Write a protein that binds this DNA or RNA. Structure first.
Ligand code: NA
Ligand code: NA
Ligand code: NI
Ligand code: NI
Length: 327
DNA sequence: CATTAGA
DNA sequence: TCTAATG
């Protein structure tokens, strides 16, 4: 956690670089497992060899580990850290909709910078266009102050179109989070569950609604169960407008909401932890259900959940207010 | 770990 | 269809 720091960080930088700039999944895949066990390692890694003894530690990484131990740096790391080609991929990548593949290809054509990107806005697809469009706001964190306003609106409409709708702004926001990076709305309605053959309009309806009044301003992608957009608080009595923000809404079969809800609320840790516990207590938990553990090894059987509580009850835990879903 | 675009 | 991208 700190004894192993610098080693694991460089190990990560190393990996990142392979996976992006280059296309070396393995190398990249290599660096991480390494980066992983060395972090679990309980003692100060004092030398290559010492590390090397690890699983996942080859001579290659060892080699690097020495050089790093030896001198506060690493050349390849210094060289990569400098490299404009590589530097660039690192950047373009930020743009919403721009992955590494694309990052590499733009770079090859010479689009390095943002400006470059604009001039060739033609080469960019919708998503990416939008990305480039809201580049700045895409980066800004959302204040819960605003987080609250947004939520106020969304629930308001959802209700309006259908009083039967169930919506939950999941995420950190749900966890008190002073700030948040983007809104996640979990949707479900009673007339949509595991079996009942869809009702696409169900998603569609509300979407309309939300753009209707001007909350949704664009569509990143919209399909029958997952809307992905941009949205924004009405600019008041002017002098101050609101930044464009990423927002996702997903429809769910009412017969899986709470797991789903549980699930997105997280935190990552709250999850696994709640996850490892449901296990001893004879169960299995995942993004949509909870199934009693069968002795024969495994077993199925979706238990009936009517709220986040039911889930705990099941695994017999303490109802954890989201506030304290932190770990 | 899956859903949507795209080409 | 595959392959990319976001979550
Ligand atoms: Na080894
Ligand atoms: Na990106
Ligand atoms: Ni998100
Ligand atoms: Ni989020």
């Amino acid at each position: 956690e700190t004894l192993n720091g610098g080693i694991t960080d460089m190990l990560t930088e190393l990996a990142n670089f392979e996976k992006n700039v280059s296309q070396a999944i393995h190398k990249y895949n290599a660096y991480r497992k390494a980066a992983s066990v060395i972090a679990k390692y309980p003692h100060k890694i004092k030398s290559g060899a010492e590390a090397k003894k690890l699983p996942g530690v080859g001579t290659k990484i060892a080699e690097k580990i020495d050089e790093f131990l030896a001198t506060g740096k690493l050349r390849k790391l210094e060289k990569i850290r400098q490299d404009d080609t590589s530097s660039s991929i690192n950047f373009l990548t930020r743009v919403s909709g721009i992955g590494p593949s694309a990052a590499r290809k733009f770079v090859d054509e010479g689009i390095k910078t943002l400006e470059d990107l604009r001039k060739n806005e033609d080469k960019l697809n919708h998503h990416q266009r939008i990305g480039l469009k809201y580049f700045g706001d895409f980066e800004k964190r959302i204040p819960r102050e605003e987080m609250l306003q947004m939520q106020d609106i969304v629930l308001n409409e959802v209700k309006k179109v259908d009083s039967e709708y169930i919506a939950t702004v999941c995420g950190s926001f749900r966890r008190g989070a002073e700030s948040s990076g983007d809104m996640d709305v979990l949707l479900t309605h009673p007339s949509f569950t595991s079996e009942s053959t869809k009702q696409p309009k169900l998603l569609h309806q509300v979407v309309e609604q939300l753009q209707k009044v001007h909350f949704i301003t664009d569509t990143l992608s919209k399909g029958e169960t997952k809307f992905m957009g941009v949205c924004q608080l009405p600019s008041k009595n002017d002098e101050k407008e609101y930044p464009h923000r990423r927002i996702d809404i997903r429809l769910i079969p009412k017969d899986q909401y709470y797991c789903g809800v549980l699930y997105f609320t997280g935190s990552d840790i709250f999850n696994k932890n709640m996850r490892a516990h449901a296990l001893e207590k004879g169960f299995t938990i995942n993004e949509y259900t909870i199934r009693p553990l069968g002795v024969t090894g495994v077993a199925g059987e979706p238990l009936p959940v009517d709220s986040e509580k039911d889930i705990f009850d099941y695994i017999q835990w303490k109802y954890r207010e989201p506030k304290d879903r932190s770990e």
